[PDB]
Amino acid sequence: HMYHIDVFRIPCHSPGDTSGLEDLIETGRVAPADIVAVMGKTEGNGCVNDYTREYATAMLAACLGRHLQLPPHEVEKRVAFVMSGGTEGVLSPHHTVFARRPAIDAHRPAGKRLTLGIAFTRDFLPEEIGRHAQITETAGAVKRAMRDAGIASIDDLHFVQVKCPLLTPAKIASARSRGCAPVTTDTYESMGYSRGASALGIALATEEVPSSMLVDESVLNDWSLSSSLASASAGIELEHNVVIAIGMSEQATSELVIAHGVMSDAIDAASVRRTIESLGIRSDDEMDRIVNVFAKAEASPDGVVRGMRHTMLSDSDINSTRHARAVTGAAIASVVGHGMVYVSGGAEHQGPAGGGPFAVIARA
Amino acid sequence: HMYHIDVFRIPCHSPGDTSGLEDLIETGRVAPADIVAVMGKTEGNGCVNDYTREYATAMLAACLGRHLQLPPHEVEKRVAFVMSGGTEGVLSPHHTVFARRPAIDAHRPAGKRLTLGIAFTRDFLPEEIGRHAQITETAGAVKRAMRDAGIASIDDLHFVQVKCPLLTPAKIASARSRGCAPVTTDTYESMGYSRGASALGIALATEEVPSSMLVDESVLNDWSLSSSLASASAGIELEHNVVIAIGMSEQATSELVIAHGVMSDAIDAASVRRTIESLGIRSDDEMDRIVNVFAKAEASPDGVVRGMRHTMLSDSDINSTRHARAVTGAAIASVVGHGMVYVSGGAEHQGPAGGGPFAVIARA
Amino acid sequence: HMYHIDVFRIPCHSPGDTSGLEDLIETGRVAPADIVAVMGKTEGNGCVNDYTREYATAMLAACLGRHLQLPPHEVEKRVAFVMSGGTEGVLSPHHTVFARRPAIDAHRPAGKRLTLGIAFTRDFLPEEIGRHAQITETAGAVKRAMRDAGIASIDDLHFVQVKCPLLTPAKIASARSRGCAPVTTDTYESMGYSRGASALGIALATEEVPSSMLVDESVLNDWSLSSSLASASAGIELEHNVVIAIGMSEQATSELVIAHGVMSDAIDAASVRRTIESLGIRSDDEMDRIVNVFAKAEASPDGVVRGMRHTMLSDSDINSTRHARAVTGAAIASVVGHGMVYVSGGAEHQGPAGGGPFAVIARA
Amino acid sequence: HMYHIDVFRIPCHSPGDTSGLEDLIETGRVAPADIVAVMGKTEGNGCVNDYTREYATAMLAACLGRHLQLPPHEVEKRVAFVMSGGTEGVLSPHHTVFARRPAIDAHRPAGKRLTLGIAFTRDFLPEEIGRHAQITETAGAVKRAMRDAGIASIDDLHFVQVKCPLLTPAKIASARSRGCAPVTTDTYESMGYSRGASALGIALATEEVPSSMLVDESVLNDWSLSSSLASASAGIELEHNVVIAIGMSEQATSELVIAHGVMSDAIDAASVRRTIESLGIRSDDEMDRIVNVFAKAEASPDGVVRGMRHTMLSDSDINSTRHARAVTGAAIASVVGHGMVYVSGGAEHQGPAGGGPFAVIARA
Ligand SMILES: O=C1CC(=O)NC(=O)N1
Ligand SMILES: O=C1CC(=O)NC(=O)N1
Numbered sequence A, B, C, D: 001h002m003y004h005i006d007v008f009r010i011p012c013h014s015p016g017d018t019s020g021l022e023d024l025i026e027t028g029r030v031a032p033a034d035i036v037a038v039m040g041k042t043e044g045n046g047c048v049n050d051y052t053r054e055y056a057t058a059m060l061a062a063c064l065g066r067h068l069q070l071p072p073h074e075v076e077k078r079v080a081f082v083m084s085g086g087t088e089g090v091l092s093p094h095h096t097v098f099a100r101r102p103a104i105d106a107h108r109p110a111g112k113r114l115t116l117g118i119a120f121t122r123d124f125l126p127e128e129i130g131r132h133a134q135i136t137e138t139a140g141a142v143k144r145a146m147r148d149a150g151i152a153s154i155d156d157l158h159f160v161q162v163k164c165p166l167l168t169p170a171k172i173a174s175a176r177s178r179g180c181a182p183v184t185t186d187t188y189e190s191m192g193y194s195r196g197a198s199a200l201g202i203a204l205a206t207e208e209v210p211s212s213m214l215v216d217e218s219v220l221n222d223w224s225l226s227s228s229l230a231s232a233s234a235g236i237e238l239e240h241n242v243v244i245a246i247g248m249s250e251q252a253t254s255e256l257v258i259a260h261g262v263m264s265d266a267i268d269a270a271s272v273r274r275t276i277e278s279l280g281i282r283s284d285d286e287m288d289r290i291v292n293v294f295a296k297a298e299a300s301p302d303g304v305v306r307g308m309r310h311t312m313l314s315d316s317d318i319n320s321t322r323h324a325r326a327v328t329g330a331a332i333a334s335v336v337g338h339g340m341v342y343v344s345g346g347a348e349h350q351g352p353a354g355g356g357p358f359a360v361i362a363r364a
C-alpha cells in the first residue's frame, strides 16, 4: 500500500473525445496499466437522461481496452470511471485521469503526499436506492477504498467521490412488481435521494455522523446530517456505487498534494481562495500549480442565498442542479481563471445545506 | 434641469408583486408622481416568450395608476418601465425604482451627483428591427435622454439602458406581406439584432463609433464596433425603444453617485471589484453602501472563455443568454455578497465581445 | 336553479390579450354581469413558475372590473377563473368563456341541456396540500357546485374542473416552521399531489371511490383509485381550490350540450371520435358544431405506451406534463382539425393511469 | 445492381443499446457483412448538443467491427449510419437496420420490390454549409445512391434520407479566420440551413426543382421550393453528407415494398392512413405488416396550423423541432398504434411548408 500517483487534466472537445488520453499514452507520460481512475465532466444535462456520461466511459474503456487487450466491460471493473454530466456556464468539459504506480521507492519525499484508492459496491435493487442498503454498502466501500489508498486515518482523508444510480420508470415498475415502493417516483428527485444516501454512507464511514441517526426517514429530510468530505454524483449508466477515496500518506511519493474545504454557499469563492492559499499559492501566476479543483454545488433548499430569494428550485425549465453548477462554476472560475474544473450538482448531506465540500490538487 | 434623484432596490416575491412599492409609497419614502423610471428583473426566461416582463409592468402601472388616478396605459407614457427577464442562478427578482424631484433646493455638496433622464422612440416596423432605422432613432433618443437628465458631456454619462422589441412569426409574416424580409426569421436571434442595433445607436450618439461604419451589414457581424456604456434588453412587450440615460451633473443634489466600467469576459469579477473600489468601498460591510449593480453578460461568441471551451452557444436546451446571466450573476454576487443585482444577457456591441459594460450606484 | 348557458371560445394572441372578450361585450354577444366562469389555456410552461396563468386572470378580472365597476380582486370572487398553462405542439392559446343567464323563459326543447355551476374552498395550509384536508374540502365544493349548477344526479354530471395550489420553497419552509412536513419538497412533484388529492376529492363526491380507501398514503400511490369525470389543474397563482361542475339538466335552456368520455392513453384519438360521434357529428364539416374539447393528458407512469417505451418521465429537459399535453393535443387536433382545445397535463387519479377523462361541448 | 433487402425495426433501451442487433446476428436472421445502412431514433434532444446520435453509431460500429474484424471508423465508411435524435412524446427509441444481399436469384417475384442504395459526400467547410457547395454535392450523392440502389427512374424513387452537418462556434470561428462568413452564427438555426440546402440538393437531383432557381439566397427563404421525397437530419457528429436512396425496382427480390406520401401539416394523419391504405393495409390487425414509418415534421413557419396560432416558434425553452416531432409522432402513433416510428424534425424544403414527406415500408 505504497504508491506514486500521477494526475492529468485533459480537455474534451466532445464527450466521446479520447485524443487527450491517446496523446498521454503515445507520448509516454502515462501507462495504460497504471490508470486506476478517471473523473470526467461531460456536456450532457447531468440529469436523468444524460447519456454523455455513459458514452465518455465507453470510449475511454474501449481506448484502454485496445492497449491492455481487454474487453471494455472488463476495463470498467478495473478502472473507476466517474462521469459527472452538466457543464453549464463557463464549465469546460474534461477528464481528470489518475494513474497509480508502486511507491517508486526512489526516496520518499519529506512531507505526506497524494494517495488514492477505489472501491465498488454490489448492484442495488430499485427499492434499495436512497435507503439503508445504499447507505451501509457505500460506507463499507469507503473503508475498502481508504485501505486500498493506504490512508492511515480520517485526518488524512481529503475527498470521497461516489458515483451512484438513479430511478427510471422501468426500475420503479420493477420495484412495484415485487410489492416494494421506491423512495420516490420522480426520476429527477431520485438522483438527490441516491446522492444523499450515498453521502450519508460516507459520513457514516468517516464517523462524521453516528450510526444511530441514519434512518431511512432522515434522507433528504435532516439537513444537519452531512459529510464535509463527500461528493456524490448520480447517473443512469450504472446500478452500483463507485467510490474514490483521495488523501495524504507518508508512504506515498507523488509529486502532488491535496487539501480540502467547504463552501458555505454556492457563491463562497472566499473558502476556495483560502484553501488554495493554504497550499502556498499566492499569485495568479502560481494558479497553474493547480492540477484541478473538485467542488459540490447546490441550490440552497430554503429558497434563499444570503437573505435574497433564488428561483433555482421553482424553475420548471432548468433544473436546480444546472443552475447550481453554473453558479459555482462561475465563482470558482473567477478565482482560478478558467472554467475547466470539476463541479457537480446536488450537495444533499454534502457539507452545509446550500453549500458543498470541495478539494484542490496541486503540485508539491 | 436640476434634480434630486432617489433610487430604491425593492424585492419581488413574484413578477406581479408590487408590495415593495406600495410600502415605499405608504411609508412616505417616495411620491408616486416623482417616479420617472423602473428597472426590473423578472423571473421569466428573459427570452422571446417571457410575459413576466409585460406582467410586472402592468401591475406597476396599475398600482401607480390608482395613486395618480390615471389609466395604466397612461402611466407607461409617463414612466420608463424596463423589465429584463431571466433571473438564473442566484439572481434575485427585484425592481429598481427611480424617483426624480426638482433640485432639492437647499444644500448641495461639492462634487457631481447622480442624475437620470429618459426618452422614447417611435414604434418600429418589423423590417426596421436590427437595422438603420433602429440605430439612428435610438441615437436620437439617447441625446434627448441626456438633455432630459441634465448631463453636460459624454464624460458625465455612465450608463444607457435601452429596452427594444423583437420578432414574432406574426411580425415576420407582416413584414413579408409588405415585400420586405426581416433581419432574421429566428425569433430568439432577433433579440440579438434588436439589442445590437440599439447598442450601436448608443455608440453613435456617444461618438464612440463613427457614423460611416454603421452599415446594416455590420450589425452582429463587426465585433470591434461597440459602446462601453450601452446596456440593451429586448422584449416582446413593446414595439418602440425605451432609453434611460444615467450619469453625473453638478446641478444634481442626489445623495447618490454612479461609476461604470467593463467586464472583459463573463467571469471578470476583478473589474467589478475595481470599480466598486473606485467609489471608496473596501470592506464587505461597506457593500451595503451599494444600492445596485447593473451589468451585461454574454456568451463569448468565439466559443471560448480564457482559452477554455464553453458550451453556452451549443446548448439547445438552455439558451446562451441564460447561461451568461447565471454566470455573471454568480461572479458579481461573489463580490457584493448576494444575487439581487441587474444582470442582462446578450452584450452585442456592448463593451468587448464576450464581455459587457456595467455600472454601480452607491451612497455619496 | 334554471339557467341559459352561453359558451364562447376566444383566441388569445398572448396571455394578457383580452380583445377577444372586449369584442364579445362591445358587440352585445355577452353581458359582463352574466359571466360566471373562464377556462383558459395560457402559453407559459404550465408548471411551477408559470405566471401566464395569473397574468391572464389579472387582465380578465381588470377588464370585467371596468365594466362592472368592481375591483379586480372582487371580480375573482364572483367569477371562476381557471387558467391552465402549457400550450405545447399545436395547442393554441385561448379562453373559454361561460355566461349564465336565468332560464331564458320562453321555449325550451325536449331533452336535457348544458348547465354549469361553480364553488370555492377555503385556503389550504402548505402541509394540507395533497392530503386529507384537500380531498374532503374539494368533495364538499363539488357538491355545492352541482347544486349551484342545478344538476340532479351524478348521471347528469359530465365534467368537474378543479384549479388547485402547489408548493414553493417558501410554503415548504412555512410548513416546516410549524413542525409539519409537506407532502413533498419537489415543487414540480407537488403539482401532481395537489391534482391527485383534488381528483380523489371529486371521486369521493361522485361516489366513484369509497370514503374508507381515501387514506393520505393512497395519493399518487394507488393507480386504481380515480374519477372518470375529474380534471385537475395545479397553479402557483392560488391557495384554495376552484371547482366548476358541468352537466345536463332538464331545467336548462342552453343551445348547447355536453358529453364526456375517457382516453385509455395519450394517443387514444378513437375514444374522442367515438364521443364526438355520440353527439351526432360525423363529417369534418360538422366539427365546427363543437364549441370546445376539454381533456386530460398524462405520461403513462409505467414508462410505456401500448407496449413501447416512452421517454417522457426520464426527460430532465422537458417535463412529462409538457410531453403529454403536446401528445394529446396533437391526437385531438388530428380529429377536430385544429389545436385550439383545452388539454391539461397530469391525470393522477383522473381516468385510467396513462389516460384521462375528456369532455366535448357542442351545439344542440 | 440486383438485390434482396431485409429491414429490421429493433428497440433500444438506451442510445448505446445494441442487444437488439447482437440478437439478430446471433440468431442468424441477418449477416453483419450484408448490413448496408442503419436509421436510428435516439433519445437526446435532436438538436445541436445531441451526442446520443454519435454514441449510438459508435456502439453499432464497434459491434459490427468485432464481427467483421474491422476498426469502427472503417465500418462507418462501409455502412450508412443515420441517427436522428429527439424522441419526444410517445416516440420510442429504436434502430431500423437495412441488409442487402445479391439478388437472391431464386425467382424474381411478380411486381417491383424494395431496393436501397447509399452514398457519401466529401467533408464540407463551415462556410459551405447551407449553401451551393452542399446543395450540388448532395444532388451528386443522390444520383450515385440511386445507381447504387438500382433505381431505374425518379418514378421508382420513394424516399431519400440525408444526414448533414451543423455549425459550432469553433467551426464558425474557423470560417471567420479564412475571411468567409458562415450562413448563420446561431448554431440551432444552422441545422435548418444544412437540412434545407441538403433537401434542395435532393430536389435538384430529382428534377423536382430547376437548377436555375437554386441560389444561396433561396435557402430557408423560398418556401415554394421543395422535394416531396427528401428527409433531412442535421447532426454534430459529422462533417459530410450521408445519403440513403430507397425505392422500387423489378430486379429486386425483397419480401418488402415501399410507398410514400406527404403530410400537409403536422397533424395530417389522413395522408398517412391513405398511404398505408394504398399498400392494402385495411384493418388495425394488418398494421403489423408495417415494418416502419419514416416522417418529417416541422413547425408551420407562418406561425399557424389550420388557421389557429401555434407557439412552437416562440418557445425559447423548447425548440420547434421538438414540438413538431412530438406532434407528428402522436398523430402517426394514433394511426399505427404505437410510437416506435421514425419522425425527424425540420422539414425545410421537404414537402409543403408546415408539412413533410413520409414513407411506409410494409411486407409484400
Ligand atoms: O453534477 C452532477 C451531474 C451528474 O452526472 N449527476 C449528478 O447528480 N451531479
Ligand atoms: O437579460 C435579458 C436580455 C434581453 O434581451 N431581455 C431580457 O428580458 N433579458
Ligand SMILES: O=C1CC(=O)NC(=O)N1
Residues within 6 Å of the ligand: C045, C046, C047, C050, C053, C083, C084, C085, C086, C191, C195, C232, C233, C234, C235, C321, C325, C343, C344, C345, C346
Ligand atoms: O395542464 C396543466 C396542468 C397543471 O397542473 N396546471 C397547468 O397550468 N397546466
Ligand SMILES: O=C1CC(=O)NC(=O)N1
Residues within 6 Å of the ligand: D045, D046, D047, D050, D053, D083, D084, D085, D086, D191, D195, D232, D233, D234, D235, D321, D325, D343, D344, D345, D346
Ligand atoms: O429530428 C431531427 C433530429 C436530428 O438529429 N437533427 C435534425 O435536424 N432532425
Ligand SMILES: [Mg+2]
Residues within 6 Å of the ligand: A226, A298, A347, A348, A349, A350, A351, A352, A353, A354, A355, A356
Ligand atoms: Mg450540502
Ligand SMILES: [Mg+2]
Residues within 6 Å of the ligand: B226, B298, B347, B348, B349, B350, B351, B352, B353, B354, B355, B356
Ligand atoms: Mg459585448
Ligand SMILES: [Mg+2]
Residues within 6 Å of the ligand: C226, C298, C347, C348, C349, C350, C351, C352, C353, C354, C355, C356
Ligand atoms: Mg389518469
Ligand SMILES: [Mg+2]
Residues within 6 Å of the ligand: D226, D298, D347, D348, D349, D350, D351, D352, D353, D354, D355, D356
Ligand atoms: Mg416542408
